Design a protein around this ligand. Sequence first.
Ligand SMILES: Cc1cc2nc3c(=O)[nH]c(=O)nc-3n(C[C@H](O)[C@H](O)[C@H](O)COP(=O)(O)O)c2cc1C
Ligand SMILES: Cc1cc2nc3c(=O)[nH]c(=O)nc-3n(C[C@H](O)[C@H](O)[C@H](O)COP(=O)(O)O)c2cc1C
Ligand SMILES: *[C@@H](c1cccc(O)c1)C1C(=O)NC(=O)NC1=O
Ligand SMILES: *[C@@H](c1cccc(O)c1)C1C(=O)NC(=O)NC1=O
Lengths: 302, 313
Amino acid sequence: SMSLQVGILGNTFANPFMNAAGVMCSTEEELAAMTESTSGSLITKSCTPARYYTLPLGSINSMNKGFDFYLAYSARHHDYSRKPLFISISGFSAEENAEMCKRLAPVAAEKGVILELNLSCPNVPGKPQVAYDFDAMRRYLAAISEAYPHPFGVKMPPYFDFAHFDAAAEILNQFPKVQFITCINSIGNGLVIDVETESVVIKPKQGFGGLGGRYVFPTALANVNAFYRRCPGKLIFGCGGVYTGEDAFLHVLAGASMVQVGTALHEEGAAIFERLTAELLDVMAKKGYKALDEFRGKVKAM
Amino acid sequence: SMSLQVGILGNTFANPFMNAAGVMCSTEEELAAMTESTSGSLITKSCTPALREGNPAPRYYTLPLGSINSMGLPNKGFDFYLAYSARHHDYSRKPLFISISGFSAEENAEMCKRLAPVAAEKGVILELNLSCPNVPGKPQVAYDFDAMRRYLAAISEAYPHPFGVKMPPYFDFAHFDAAAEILNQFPKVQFITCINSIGNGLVIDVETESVVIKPKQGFGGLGGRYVFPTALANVNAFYRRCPGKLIFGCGGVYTGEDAFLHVLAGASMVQVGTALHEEGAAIFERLTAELLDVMAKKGYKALDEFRGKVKAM
Ligand SMILES: Cc1cc2nc3c(=O)[nH]c(=O)nc-3n(C[C@H](O)[C@H](O)[C@H](O)COP(=O)(O)O)c2cc1C
Ligand SMILES: Cc1cc2nc3c(=O)[nH]c(=O)nc-3n(C[C@H](O)[C@H](O)[C@H](O)COP(=O)(O)O)c2cc1C
Ligand SMILES: *[C@@H](c1cccc(O)c1)C1C(=O)NC(=O)NC1=O
Ligand SMILES: *[C@@H](c1cccc(O)c1)C1C(=O)NC(=O)NC1=O
């Protein structure tokens, strides 16, 4: 009757849900829990070649086992009969990312793991989000496209004006290997102070860190839709502020193919996926929808 | 004993609270209500040289944790706010700020030339809006550092008095540093208001499957609880980088504890937008009481005992 299936990148995903990179995906036990859950997919922690605080309305963070570990997991330890796997990489240079992609390529070809390239980590000492520098963004994507023979996706930071949406999309549309865009990473460099101690709540970088959870939901929907509109030849994955199936429904209406869950999954654990699928199917049932293809991107004007 | 007084800009303010520009400050009745309130100050709606009727409605919507707006600069025009400052405002009640938001550097310079004698005679204080996120086809001016410098140079040439700037949020230290470096080169910039709304969010209603505000495909500026950690970050980042300037905090204030944290991050004044839209001007009685409660539990007698004194871990 109804289905949450999503048929993309050549795979049938059972439902659109997965963890957000960095949440519940660092240890063998966590990857196993994600694999055993009802999520449609899972992604690893952003890795490099070789901290968190719960807030009333979400989270702030300033946060790997190395690329070797997550490659070996993708190569020999992940059960692909359960669900597909994504791997996130966030090298410190175009070259570091490229050397990783060259080593990832035989594993992607043989097992099917899919690369998400992180251009938006807001916590790299002395180095702003890569995708806030459009010249650097273009060099990274050219370097990866030359080094990596396979399709990949990009994790984007939020933008806040149409001139930036336009410029980012114009660059991404020049790279046909970029088959998906994940909107969004955390809202960078927020600051939380505790009233009683009069002190910041995370230690690095004078307390500044990336925001997730309820704080980011309208920004996340805006970025999903902005890129859905400007990159019709690519898929958009939504990430940001998802706590319920209604939240996921709104991300799909904005354009999302997959829906990633970060802060809410950190708080609730992998059982959240059982609740999210039920809730989303319930919204669909009330509206008579039978498939996500019927309303993905179909947000209406007022 | 305890006190919320602020002594800045050659004025004495009874407490740090004021409305945020654009909230409860467009008509004479709203301005009189703000003046009759217990707020420490007030600011007018950002104005353009001529009156504007604004974007089509609905252009504001109440969210679970705040607001979204595409107001589109509806305002009675500069001549109306100038007349308010020159002839109607009771300065014995509290100091007044005037917000201006012309569509180019030259429009703002022309308004400043006419404002200058009124500022001199009456003492109204200029806040220049460099961050409106709802101008058709033109991004936040302060997201274009070359344009920002041009605006500050044009105003500085045209306007003899010190003034403040309403800034959009930034999200990385490279931008904090670039913005600060520019502001520190303009001696007439005496205060920096952090922040305007987080631009170009989007809200969709589950039932209608439609955007909830009409203009610009539903994209609009976010206020309220969504913006608080970003606001505090911006206040503190500029407080650290522009020690020669005052910082005014704006964003996410609903309680005296929220205000306390703005001040701890560096705020001299604290502006209230969405929460004031919702509660009305009695909010200022509650915010002062709550802020005094925080101070009493900590033994603070004056805001300078803790302003800017956020601690590391
Ligand atoms: C503790 C933590 C660690 C994260 N680590 C990563 C990471 O390694 N790579 C990445 O792309 N995003 C990382 N993120 C960002 C999330 O993937 C997600 O983009 C963000 O939290 C917004 O989603 P949410 O509102 O559901 O939390 C991290 C988020 C948190 C809270
Ligand atoms: C309806 C509305 C109208 C606004 N109009 C202006 C404006 O004219 N000038 C300006 O500088 N900011 C304007 N703003 C932004 C507010 O001054 C403020 O920066 C923002 O709402 C964040 O504060 P808050 O979290 O308390 O709402 C407006 C905000 C709202 C909600
Ligand atoms: C950035 C990050 C990249 C690689 C490794 C690591 O530990 C972190 C990261 C991000 O992308 N998003 C976020 O919210 N927090 C981070 O630390
Ligand atoms: C921007 C605005 C620009 C020009 C004139 C005017 O009256 C307002 C405005 C802003 O600064 N902040 C906000 O949240 N909404 C807007 O529409």
